[PDB]
Amino acid sequence: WEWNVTWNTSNPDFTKCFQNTVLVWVPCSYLWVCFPFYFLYLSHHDRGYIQMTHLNKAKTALGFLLWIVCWADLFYSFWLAPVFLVSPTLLGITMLLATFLIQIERRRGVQSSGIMLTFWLIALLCALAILRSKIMTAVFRDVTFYIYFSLVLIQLVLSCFSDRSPLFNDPNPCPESSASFLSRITFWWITGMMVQGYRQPLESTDLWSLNKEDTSEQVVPVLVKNWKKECAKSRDPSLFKVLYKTFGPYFLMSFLFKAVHDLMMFAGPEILKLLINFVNDKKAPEWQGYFYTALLFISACLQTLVLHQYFHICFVSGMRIKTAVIGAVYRKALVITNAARKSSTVGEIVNLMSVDAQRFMDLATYINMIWSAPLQVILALYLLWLNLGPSVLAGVAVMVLMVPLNAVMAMKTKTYQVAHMKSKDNRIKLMNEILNGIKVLKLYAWELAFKDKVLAIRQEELKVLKKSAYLAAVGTFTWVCTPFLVALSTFAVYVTVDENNILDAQKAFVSLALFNILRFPLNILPMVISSIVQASVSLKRLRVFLSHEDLDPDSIQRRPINSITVKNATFTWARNDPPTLHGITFSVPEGSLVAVVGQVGCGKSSLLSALLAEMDKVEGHVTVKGSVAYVPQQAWIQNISLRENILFGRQLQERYYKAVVEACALLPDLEILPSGDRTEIGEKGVNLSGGQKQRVSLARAVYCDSDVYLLDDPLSAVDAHVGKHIFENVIGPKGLLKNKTRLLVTHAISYLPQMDVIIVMSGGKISEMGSYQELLARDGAFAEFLRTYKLSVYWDYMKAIGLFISFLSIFLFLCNHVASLVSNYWLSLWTDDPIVNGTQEHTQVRLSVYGALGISQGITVFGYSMAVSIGGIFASRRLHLDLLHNVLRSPISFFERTPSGNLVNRFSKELDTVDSMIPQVIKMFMGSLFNVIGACIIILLATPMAAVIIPPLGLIYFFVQRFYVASSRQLKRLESVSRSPVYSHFNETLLGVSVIRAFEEQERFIRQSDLKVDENQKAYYPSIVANRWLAVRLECVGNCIVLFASLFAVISRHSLSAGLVGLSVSYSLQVTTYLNWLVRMSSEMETNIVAVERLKEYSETEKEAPWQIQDMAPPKDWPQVGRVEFRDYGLRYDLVLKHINVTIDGGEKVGIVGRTGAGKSSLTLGLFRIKESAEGEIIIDDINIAKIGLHDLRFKITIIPQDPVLFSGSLRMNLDPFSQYSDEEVWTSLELAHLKGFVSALPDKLNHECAEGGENLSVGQRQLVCLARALLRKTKILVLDEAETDDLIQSTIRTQFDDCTVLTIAHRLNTIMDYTRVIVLDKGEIQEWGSPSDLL
Ligand SMILES: Nc1ncnc2c1ncn2[C@@H]1O[C@@H]2CO[P@](=O)(S)O[C@@H]3[C@H](O)[C@@H](CO[P@](=O)(S)O[C@H]2[C@H]1O)O[C@H]3n1cnc2c(N)ncnc21
């Protein structure tokens, strides 16, 4: 080995000794160190044995021949040089290990081998090096090497194909367990779903099944066993030891991958330095440059692959951790004791299964960086120290200064997040009031007053939004300025400290790239530490939960079908609490009806709990015989259909089910319910009354067909007749359970004489049990008891911002881009200056221009960021105003017809998406896009002839981005949807655990929780593999960019300078992260901007007639006398109102009578123009209503509706939202409304803060407040809608409103009789038109 023929030569040939020693020791050596380790995996992991195939044999036969050929060399050598003996024998022996290895891999079930692939690849490269040397040298021993190389190449090609699957069916399988090594490395096996997801929108059944190891049925038992072993071995069992003993061995493979990734990441800058030296070192061979470029490419590709495999390992381990923790928590919760369960909140345990398990899932990613981040940083620092000197300390002095500052920013906006949120809550509250009370507002035309309050709350919100906006600007400013800041600081210090310090390309750009690989190892440290602390508290929470005690099954001697036996048994609800049932003894024979009798808190329900092993048995002997059906006091209802509630996971028997349903008198309940017995009962579905829930619980118990029934007050909530019917057909001796041992807890005497045995107790003690007649004859405790009683959406958003602001932001951001680019170009020009008299010709003016360029970059970064901040706030204001106007201008038919509920999330969730997320997303997406464009242009500018690589790589990027965004924003939705049922099922199980355990159906519910967690994992796993697929494709694109940039710089290093090549390579190295985040941000934008599209709704939705016409406005006293005339009125709704020709004279009391379905109420809607007249000419006095603007008439006519709607705020704002009427008028109207006494009583006087809907006020008061509103209006036309205070409101409407014309729609004839001229409506027609005297 000497440098003349290997390094400094036109023809670089490895020396003969090097060829025969190191190039042969490398591959043979690889298999020798891996062989032992590989038995661990081959042994621990097995999948059967693969059959005898031609491929496997072909590989084995070539392994035999290859060994022979290599030993044939030893034979010829035997037929001087020491290397001609040991090397052939070593190669033959490692070859014999290779063929044995494919043999054992067949035995252990391996379709494709990564070892048997990397090993052949390394051997091939070594053979290639010797091959080239041997063909450049030119029979005797050469031909043996050619045969060896050809066989090795064919072996390598064979090793790529995947063998047949073993005899270990698998519908919709996961191709991970069947794909070959190359597909697993490149993650190609998911591209199928990627293309298919782009064409056919994914559903829950298209998702692949889970591999056997990820199923909860294979990860929960191992954790359960390990935790049991630790618990039985122990003081204070530790969950962390269990965790790292159970899933640690699979996790430790991440360590190697992380170390290799770190080393390969650092290998980049070293090769960059070598290339910068090469371009500066003219008169050097081109072979060195091409070797350096190939080294860069191979290192980058290998680092990408290893890192992405590391990512997959960590995510799979986290998924297993989550699944196992979920399963163990479920089983523990099903086992733990009531005493230990009551202390912890139910919501606490649900949080235990949600937030702590999710934190454990996410922790697996940032746990290796506990050592990767420091070492990286340290190593990077050392390299930087090797490069420049102590001055670099000042260069990083600001990076470490950004870690706290940025943190301080985030925490700050969190407080802002708390402020904004608070105001938003108020806003939505107010909006909710308007949404459920839009009827009253339109009637009084108070819409604009409420719009003003909404705008005031919006101003309050936008103040905090403006402050957060200004804070966000500097956060972006620092992020973009960091690179320039570190470069300028370190370079200025380096130049100023000593004039002999020469700034070369290697001394500027290598340290510049080391700064880029320093940003990440340092900025993630706070996140890592915070996640570790949260995971530690989660470990504490899980450990204390999993160490809880449990109920004792031994307490009850459950025996297969003297039925219930208790002797001298005392039970507790806790270990230290006193007994609740002291010294209980009783024997219940088979098929006997026993009633527990006592007062409240006696211990009746405790007896049934004790028979189910729910109480803590401190002493005694209980021998319940046969299956037990428990009807609890608090009915537990599953959210499944009523049929499956009664069935309870049991085979449906139509005759038995139909005998059970009516015997519980559940037939009326089935009839009222919409779908019958298929209705979704429970908290989530249709709510049921308590009696119905008790009925369903009893029906479930009766269907379960147990021999022993424990009925803890099944008839508490059912009525007396229903209860007697139930007892007759179910519990009584002539019911369904005639031969069943029934034990009932009751406090009702009605069925007591029919009971075979009455167990009467007092204070948890057996007190003279016996039969009813005998107990009555004894006249003791029982007698005492008885005696007790789409590109256009982007343009729309730009218009909402305004064209000027958007254009200015784009221009300033382009200015930032050009400033950064010219900063880089200035650095390149600066690094190329010659050295005269031992110092650069120019070094102060270059620093000044560098500083000026960077300061300009910083000011424009802070500027355009502030622009979009103001723009975003402007757009939020304009969009909210437009949406509010469209909503309030729409007719009532819109509110009635629209799904009531889709407006609320539009005002709350989508508006929140607009004002906060959209500006941040547009900022970071635009930044990433122009970072990519800047990398491309600085590559193309420095090397003009590099435009041939842009088209293919752009096509690859476009295809990958299209497929990923389309197929990932759907997988995320699938996973989100699937997550909720797990926590819902845990809530159901937690709520019904006593019933679950009593029926002994805990195994079925354990299996059910298996399915839901597996379903969630089936959608979560493709998402992370999708991220990996993005990752590999985009890093391949970036590595191709790096390779082509370096290649095109090396091919023309002469017409180029060192600094230009350095800058090109540094930016090409950076471009990969920018590309990845550009795709991720584009996906974010695509699913985010649609909010604006759904906020631009109701833009054309038919609106009401204009509120103010102002061309045909009425006079101030429009209702001069109040002469109403319905001239052929017809109201569309086919026609509810038809042929209405009536005349109500001014100041004449008129009422409207009719049955349900008539046009009584619709007639009022005619007066106020709620629905446009299909055919009609209603005219008040001498003016048509349809011509008048809505507000005008709605202000000149008043209505007292069915249910008065009192809005949140003061009483004065309820009476006069506009505050138009003076305080004296309000006081007079309130006094005239029989409310002066009450209104003077509130401490806040007229400013009494009434809650949502006036909950604090009574219904009578709210009605009188509505009457006060009508009285304060002082209008000549008033309408009344009648449904205790009726006497008061009727007298008040008869007191002073006699001057005004009053229409009255009352469902009661008593009040209408007083009003003359009654109009009767049969089906919209005027049945009778005359006074009540003419009516009778
Ligand atoms: N191997 C690696 N080496 C270098 N860095 C790596 C990395 N892997 C991950 N990153 C991260 O990718 C981003 C790289 O920077 P960019 O891609 S140039 O821009 C960021 C990014 O686009 C997104 C968030 O990406 P992010 O996860 S937060 O963090 C950084 C970086 O830490 O928004 C931008 N961004 C970040 N902060 C701000 C801000 N205050 N104002 C405006 N835009 C901001």
Side-chain angles (χ1 to χ4, degrees):
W1 174 269
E2 293 177 350
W3 271 248
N4 184 13
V5 73
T6 306
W7 189 271
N8 187 60
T9 169
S10 177
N11 304 300
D13 189 1
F14 264 123
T15 50
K16 293 179 179 179
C17 179
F18 201 96
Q19 289 169 232
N20 289 337
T21 71
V22 181
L23 294 199
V24 77
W25 292 348
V26 168
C28 316
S29 178
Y30 174 61
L31 201 70
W32 276 120
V33 53
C34 182
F35 163 58
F37 264 90
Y38 208 41
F39 259 51
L40 190 89
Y41 295 94
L42 286 194
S43 61
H44 182 197
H45 300 291
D46 198 301
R47 295 176 64 186
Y49 59 91
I50 306 331
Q51 295 295 100
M52 261 315 288
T53 205
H54 328 86
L55 168 78
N56 174 240
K57 183 178 179 180
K59 214 172 311 183
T60 299
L62 292 176
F64 296 162
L65 185 58
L66 262 168
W67 165 58
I68 296 303
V69 164
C70 305
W71 271 29
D73 180 3
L74 178 72
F75 302 165
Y76 207 117
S77 178
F78 199 116
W79 181 6
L80 291 191
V83 84
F84 283 175
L85 301 321
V86 171
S87 172
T89 301
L90 168 70
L91 209 175
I93 303 301
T94 189
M95 188 55 78
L96 202 64
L97 188 66
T99 176
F100 164 63
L101 192 65
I102 57 188
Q103 273 288 358
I104 170 181
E105 252 179 357
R106 182 260 280 271
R107 181 177 181 170
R108 294 291 180 60
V110 173
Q111 300 181 239
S112 178
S113 176
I115 306 308
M116 293 302 308
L117 203 43
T118 50
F119 163 63
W120 291 134
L121 186 74
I122 288 177
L124 180 82
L125 298 194
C126 300
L128 282 174
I130 306 177
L131 185 74
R132 167 178 164 281
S133 165
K134 281 181 152 67
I135 205 186
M136 292 177 72
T137 305
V139 169
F140 42 102
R141 203 169 307 87
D142 180 20
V143 57
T144 80
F145 171 71
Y146 282 39
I147 271 161
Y148 165 87
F149 168 77
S150 293
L151 290 204
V152 160
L153 174 62
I154 303 301
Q155 203 77 299
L156 168 92
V157 176
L158 280 189
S159 201
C160 295
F161 301 127
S162 63
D163 207 327
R164 295 176 64 186
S165 64
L167 299 191
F168 72 121
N169 60 300
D170 47 301
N172 213 299
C174 209
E176 159 68 18
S177 61
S178 155
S180 51
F181 177 73
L182 278 167
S183 290
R184 297 149 81 259
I185 286 321
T186 322
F187 286 123
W188 201 275
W189 48 278
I190 211 150
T191 201
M193 274 195 339
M194 290 316 199
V195 69
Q196 173 273 340
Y198 173 72
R199 324 161 321 171
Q200 312 170 300
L202 308 191
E203 293 177 350
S204 304
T205 89
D206 176 40
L207 280 163
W208 290 328
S209 295
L210 267 176
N211 38 11
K212 273 302 298 302
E213 200 54 8
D214 289 345
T215 77
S216 163
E217 201 74 3
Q218 288 254 304
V219 300
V220 175
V222 54
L223 184 60
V224 157
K225 175 182 180 59
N226 262 119
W227 181 241
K228 188 183 61 43
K229 175 162 308 310
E230 183 65 13
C231 196
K233 174 192 311 323
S234 314
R235 295 185 182 176
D236 325 297
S238 73
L239 187 71
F240 181 46
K241 286 179 49 55
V242 174
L243 288 197
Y244 80 66
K245 286 280 301 318
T246 321
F247 319 102
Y250 185 79
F251 197 39
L252 262 282
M253 209 207 330
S254 167
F255 172 94
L256 167 77
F257 286 163
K258 206 55 181 61
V260 171
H261 160 69
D262 267 30
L263 260 59
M264 297 328 290
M265 156 175 316
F266 283 114
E270 272 332 274
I271 296 296
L272 158 68
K273 171 213 300 305
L274 295 183
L275 205 80
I276 281 185
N277 206 337
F278 163 59
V279 289
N280 157 253
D281 176 349
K282 297 291 175 65
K283 302 177 181 180
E286 287 280 355
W287 150 77
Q288 292 197 240
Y290 287 95
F291 175 62
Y292 292 147
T293 292
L295 219 46
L296 251 182
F297 176 64
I298 185 175
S299 62
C301 260
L302 160 83
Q303 163 214 30
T304 279
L305 298 187
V306 170
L307 170 74
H308 298 355
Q309 301 307 120
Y310 145 67
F311 279 171
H312 192 240
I313 298 300
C314 271
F315 276 129
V316 168
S317 189
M319 175 192 318
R320 279 181 200 171
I321 283 271
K322 172 224 201 179
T323 314
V325 154
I326 282 186
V329 159
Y330 197 94
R331 280 150 181 77
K332 195 54 184 176
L334 257 184
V335 172
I336 49 177
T337 166
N338 181 61
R341 212 203 79 67
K342 197 59 61 164
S343 71
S344 299
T345 319
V346 167
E348 225 278 317
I349 317 187
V350 179
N351 288 337
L352 199 35
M353 227 178 68
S354 158
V355 310
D356 284 7
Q358 268 303 326
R359 294 215 215 99
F360 272 142
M361 193 154 141
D362 288 19
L363 169 89
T365 303
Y366 329 116
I367 176 67
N368 291 119
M369 281 145 188
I370 203 56
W371 60 258
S372 173
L375 163 85
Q376 212 164 126
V377 162
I378 289 303
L379 190 54
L381 203 162
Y382 168 59
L383 290 207
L384 285 147
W385 202 112
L386 160 78
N387 229 16
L388 284 179
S391 64
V392 79
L393 179 73
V396 306
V398 75
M399 283 217 165
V400 65
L401 224 47
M402 225 75 59
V403 181
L405 192 87
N406 247 336
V408 180
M409 310 274 88
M411 201 264 298
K412 283 310 309 313
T413 169
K414 183 178 179 180
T415 83
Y416 291 150
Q417 218 46 57
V418 162
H420 185 288
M421 213 60 57
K422 180 167 329 321
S423 277
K424 153 168 280 294
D425 192 3
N426 202 277
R427 215 276 296 279
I428 204 54
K429 213 162 33 56
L430 197 162
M431 292 291 328
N432 225 33
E433 204 159 56
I434 304 191
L435 277 206
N436 311 327
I438 207 50
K439 303 315 305 313
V440 158
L441 292 203
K442 294 183 177 299
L443 291 173
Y444 304 133
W446 288 350
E447 293 176 298
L448 295 174
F450 277 72
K451 161 160 172 300
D452 192 46
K453 265 190 274 185
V454 164
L455 266 280
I457 303 288
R458 184 80 181 150
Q459 226 84 38
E460 294 324 291
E461 195 182 305
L462 283 199
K463 180 155 55 61
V464 162
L465 205 64
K466 187 52 60 61
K467 190 43 65 192
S468 182
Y470 190 123
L471 193 81
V474 58
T476 298
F477 160 62
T478 59
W479 183 246
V480 183
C481 180
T482 302
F484 154 70
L485 208 39
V486 296
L488 177 90
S489 190
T490 198
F491 292 155
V493 170
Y494 190 36
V495 165
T496 320
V497 153
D498 289 345
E499 51 206 40
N500 304 310
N501 291 321
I502 321 298
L503 208 76
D504 201 1
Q506 47 183 55
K507 269 170 161 286
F509 289 116
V510 166
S511 53
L512 201 67
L514 285 172
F515 278 157
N516 176 60
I517 70 178
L518 182 79
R519 199 173 205 180
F520 198 111
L522 181 72
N523 284 57
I524 196 173
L525 225 44
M527 171 85 88
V528 163
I529 299 199
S530 204
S531 277
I532 285 192
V533 169
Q534 305 193 286
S536 173
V537 78
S538 289
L539 271 193
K540 171 187 178 180
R541 298 163 195 239
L542 265 190
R543 196 271 303 280
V544 76
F545 177 54
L546 256 61
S547 281
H548 270 173
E549 304 303 299
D550 50 359
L551 294 173
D552 298 359
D554 312 300
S555 171
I556 318 297
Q557 313 309 300
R558 298 201 171 181
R559 292 173 187 179
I561 315 171
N562 73 115
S563 176
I564 299 174
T565 279
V566 172
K567 293 179 179 179
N568 203 62
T570 169
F571 306 96
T572 38
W573 273 123
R575 294 183 181 277
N576 303 62
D577 300 358
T580 307
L581 307 184
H582 323 80
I584 270 69
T585 190
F586 68 92
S587 302
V588 175
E590 271 224 74
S592 92
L593 183 56
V594 173
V596 190
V597 155
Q599 293 177 335
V600 155
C602 170
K604 308 163 292 165
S605 305
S606 296
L607 186 60
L608 300 197
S609 299
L611 298 178
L612 304 155
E614 299 260 328
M615 305 228 62
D616 161 350
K617 174 166 99 34
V618 175
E619 206 188 14
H621 199 196
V622 191
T623 302
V624 170
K625 196 156 72 73
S627 34
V628 183
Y630 185 41
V631 178
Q633 197 175 11
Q634 216 147 21
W636 179 60
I637 289 308
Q638 293 192 264
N639 253 308
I640 61 191
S641 59
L642 196 140
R643 192 153 200 299
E644 316 287 326
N645 273 260
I646 298 186
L647 283 187
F648 210 48
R650 183 170 263 85
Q651 172 62 58
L652 74 102
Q653 285 135 108
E654 176 23 62
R655 293 182 183 174
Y656 203 126
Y657 182 71
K658 183 178 179 180
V660 163
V661 164
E662 183 178 2
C664 297
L666 256 165
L667 277 189
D669 318 322
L670 285 206
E671 292 310 53
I672 165 63
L673 285 163
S675 205
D677 55 275
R678 312 273 209 309
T679 183
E680 214 86 341
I681 60 173
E683 41 177 59
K684 183 178 179 180
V686 296
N687 67 51
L688 256 56
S689 80
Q692 298 173 297
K693 302 227 303 311
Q694 293 272 242
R695 287 172 195 119
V696 178
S697 312
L698 180 61
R700 158 177 74 217
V702 172
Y703 193 105
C704 282
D705 182 272
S706 307
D707 184 1
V708 180
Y709 281 69
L710 305 190
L711 317 180
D712 166 3
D713 219 37
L715 307 188
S716 69
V718 305
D719 301 0
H721 211 29
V722 174
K724 211 222 64 53
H725 169 266
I726 284 182
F727 194 91
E728 215 46 277
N729 289 337
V730 172
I731 318 155
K734 299 152 311 305
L736 261 156
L737 314 146
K738 310 191 333 311
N739 289 337
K740 313 292 179 208
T741 301
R742 302 138 299 180
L743 208 174
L744 197 144
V745 158
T746 169
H747 54 290
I749 328 291
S750 309
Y751 322 118
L752 279 199
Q754 303 159 31
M755 315 296 203
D756 281 6
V757 187
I758 293 184
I759 289 180
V760 50
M761 53 204 312
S762 179
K765 226 180 302 304
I766 277 295
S767 170
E768 293 177 350
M769 74 180 130
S771 295
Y772 184 92
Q773 293 177 335
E774 314 192 11
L775 280 206
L776 177 63
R778 293 182 183 174
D779 207 65
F782 187 43
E784 179 22 61
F785 168 60
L786 287 206
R787 186 179 183 180
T788 299
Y789 176 77
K790 54 212 161 293
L791 211 53
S792 185
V793 306
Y794 298 99
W795 193 250
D796 271 342
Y797 178 71
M798 304 199 12
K799 275 206 309 302
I801 279 191
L803 280 190
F804 177 71
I805 296 291
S806 67
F807 274 7
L808 183 86
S809 64
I810 287 177
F811 164 98
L812 295 187
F813 155 63
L814 281 150
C815 183
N816 168 35
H817 192 217
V818 171
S820 198
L821 283 189
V822 173
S823 156
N824 291 124
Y825 205 125
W826 191 258
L827 190 43
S828 82
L829 219 52
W830 182 11
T831 40
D832 301 353
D833 51 5
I835 297 98
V836 309
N837 307 60
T839 297
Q840 286 178 354
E841 49 170 1
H842 298 177
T843 207
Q844 285 172 326
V845 70
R846 303 258 201 226
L847 198 35
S848 309
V849 181
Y850 198 29
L853 265 287
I855 300 331
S856 75
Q857 163 192 124
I859 65 183
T860 183
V861 159
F862 187 57
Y864 90 109
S865 61
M866 276 177 94
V868 67
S869 300
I870 307 301
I873 267 71
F874 261 124
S876 86
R877 204 141 60 81
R878 297 207 193 309
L879 264 182
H880 180 223
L881 251 196
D882 290 346
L883 160 74
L884 196 75
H885 260 298
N886 291 324
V887 162
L888 264 70
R889 281 306 191 300
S890 61
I892 180 54
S893 158
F894 156 81
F895 292 115
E896 190 41 75
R897 150 191 55 280
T898 186
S900 194
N902 79 332
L903 288 157
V904 202
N905 60 23
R906 196 183 318 257
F907 278 64
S908 45
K909 184 43 42 193
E910 256 155 27
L911 194 137
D912 213 318
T913 291
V914 165
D915 54 328
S916 64
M917 271 325 307
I918 296 284
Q920 201 50 242
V921 177
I922 197 77
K923 280 158 62 178
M924 68 193 88
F925 157 76
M926 213 165 48
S928 310
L929 158 79
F930 273 50
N931 263 334
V932 159
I933 292 304
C936 277
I937 191 179
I938 207 71
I939 289 166
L940 261 70
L941 174 72
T943 309
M945 192 255 268
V948 298
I949 171 55
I950 301 304
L953 288 206
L955 176 69
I956 291 312
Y957 171 93
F958 153 71
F959 263 122
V960 170
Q961 170 222 6
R962 155 198 284 182
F963 286 139
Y964 172 87
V965 60
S967 276
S968 92
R969 63 185 171 118
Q970 289 157 42
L971 284 182
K972 293 179 179 179
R973 191 173 43 66
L974 284 172
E975 191 264 355
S976 177
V977 166
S978 307
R979 168 169 309 200
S980 305
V982 186
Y983 308 140
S984 90
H985 185 96
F986 196 28
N987 192 285
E988 285 270 10
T989 295
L990 279 187
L991 283 194
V993 59
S994 187
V995 163
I996 301 282
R997 185 179 301 118
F999 285 89
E1000 276 282 1
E1001 260 181 68
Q1002 39 209 311
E1003 183 269 339
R1004 196 172 61 77
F1005 272 81
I1006 284 192
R1007 182 240 290 160
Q1008 273 204 27
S1009 185
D1010 196 38
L1011 290 194
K1012 277 152 199 48
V1013 179
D1014 204 285
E1015 194 61 43
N1016 181 235
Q1017 301 328 118
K1018 278 200 324 175
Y1020 168 76
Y1021 183 57
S1023 196
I1024 60 184
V1025 184
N1027 285 302
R1028 291 298 91 60
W1029 179 69
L1030 228 42
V1032 280
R1033 303 303 180 257
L1034 288 203
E1035 311 325 326
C1036 270
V1037 165
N1039 287 182
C1040 187
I1041 283 285
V1042 160
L1043 163 82
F1044 270 54
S1046 292
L1047 203 69
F1048 282 127
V1050 152
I1051 196 190
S1052 181
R1053 64 150 187 178
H1054 308 118
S1055 303
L1056 254 51
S1057 52
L1060 262 184
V1061 174
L1063 176 59
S1064 303
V1065 177
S1066 70
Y1067 263 63
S1068 66
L1069 285 179
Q1070 291 207 332
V1071 73
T1072 83
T1073 59
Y1074 307 143
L1075 223 47
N1076 184 23
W1077 272 113
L1078 178 55
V1079 168
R1080 192 158 303 118
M1081 281 333 299
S1082 203
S1083 92
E1084 186 59 61
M1085 189 145 288
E1086 151 157 15
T1087 192
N1088 265 359
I1089 219 76
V1090 82
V1092 175
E1093 169 64 16
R1094 195 171 341 290
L1095 278 206
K1096 225 65 178 59
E1097 290 198 1
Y1098 321 132
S1099 57
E1100 321 291 357
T1101 287
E1102 286 302 317
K1103 304 294 170 47
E1104 285 186 299
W1107 290 345
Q1108 315 267 33
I1109 299 282
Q1110 207 33 275
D1111 289 345
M1112 29 189 42
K1116 304 178 180 180
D1117 189 2
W1118 168 48
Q1120 285 107 4
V1121 68
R1123 181 177 181 170
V1124 187
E1125 168 184 337
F1126 293 78
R1127 177 178 315 157
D1128 196 6
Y1129 200 44
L1131 187 67
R1132 186 182 178 180
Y1133 176 77
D1134 289 345
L1135 297 204
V1136 168
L1137 265 57
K1138 198 186 306 181
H1139 291 61
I1140 305 196
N1141 225 338
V1142 73
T1143 312
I1144 307 164
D1145 322 307
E1148 295 302 320
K1149 298 292 180 65
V1150 153
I1152 286 98
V1153 185
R1155 319 321 163 171
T1156 307
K1160 315 151 54 59
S1161 300
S1162 302
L1163 198 75
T1164 311
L1165 301 197
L1167 278 184
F1168 296 86
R1169 292 248 306 289
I1170 304 304
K1171 293 199 297 298
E1172 298 309 299
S1173 59
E1175 184 51 279
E1177 291 106 300
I1178 307 182
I1179 294 169
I1180 287 175
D1181 303 0
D1182 294 359
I1183 302 196
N1184 186 1
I1185 314 305
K1187 303 299 162 295
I1188 296 296
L1190 286 189
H1191 271 185
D1192 280 353
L1193 67 102
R1194 291 168 172 183
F1195 275 138
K1196 301 301 190 179
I1197 307 152
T1198 175
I1199 167 160
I1200 298 161
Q1202 293 177 335
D1203 298 359
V1205 180
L1206 249 62
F1207 298 96
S1208 57
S1210 58
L1211 255 70
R1212 210 204 142 77
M1213 299 261 102
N1214 281 345
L1215 269 70
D1216 195 3
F1218 301 85
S1219 76
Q1220 181 185 59
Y1221 298 95
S1222 309
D1223 213 321
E1224 293 177 350
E1225 287 88 289
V1226 174
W1227 273 127
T1228 311
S1229 307
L1230 264 169
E1231 184 273 306
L1232 289 189
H1234 303 222
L1235 250 172
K1236 168 130 297 176
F1238 200 110
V1239 72
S1240 204
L1242 305 318
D1244 309 301
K1245 293 179 179 179
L1246 290 185
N1247 307 1
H1248 187 219
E1249 293 177 350
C1250 53
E1252 183 178 2
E1255 303 290 339
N1256 51 352
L1257 268 78
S1258 179
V1259 53
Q1261 322 304 67
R1262 295 179 294 240
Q1263 272 131 6
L1264 266 308
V1265 170
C1266 173
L1267 179 288
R1269 305 187 312 236
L1271 186 31
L1272 183 48
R1273 284 281 272 310
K1274 293 179 179 179
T1275 61
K1276 276 279 208 313
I1277 308 203
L1278 160 57
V1279 193
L1280 263 291
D1281 279 297
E1282 265 51 62
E1284 175 57 60
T1285 186
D1286 305 0
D1287 51 0
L1288 229 60
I1289 167 63
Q1290 278 314 321
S1291 171
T1292 310
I1293 192 45
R1294 179 177 325 320
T1295 295
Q1296 185 64 60
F1297 271 120
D1298 324 302
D1299 206 323
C1300 312
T1301 297
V1302 182
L1303 290 87
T1304 304
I1305 294 147
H1307 312 302
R1308 271 175 343 260
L1309 273 295
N1310 192 31
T1311 77
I1312 214 66
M1313 273 297 317
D1314 289 345
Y1315 311 119
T1316 76
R1317 280 151 183 177
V1318 168
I1319 308 161
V1320 181
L1321 302 191
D1322 47 296
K1323 297 181 180 181
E1325 296 278 357
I1326 311 286
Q1327 196 54 59
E1328 295 302 320
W1329 163 233
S1331 278
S1333 305
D1334 289 345
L1335 205 85
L1336 303 321

